[PDB]
Design a binder for this molecule. Structure first.
Ligand code: BOG
Ligand code: BOG
Length: 22
């Protein structure tokens, strides 16, 4: 479950960064 949570947060953070860059 911690793998799931950490990975969701990591992917969402990546999406936020990408949207900012775009
Ligand atoms: C999965 C979640 C990733 C954990 C990231 C660690 C949190 O990050 C930490 O949060 C603290 C909260 O006060 C801040 O004080 C630290 O400066 C910040 O680096
Ligand atoms: C699934 C594809 C997502 C692509 C994410 C692109 C992240 C970088 O994107 C590019 O970044 C440049 C500066 O960093 C900007 O000047 C460009 O306009 C932006 O397109």
């Amino acid at each position: 479950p911690l793998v799931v949570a950490a990975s969701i947060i990591a992917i969402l953070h990546l999406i936020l960064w990408a949207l900012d860059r775009l």
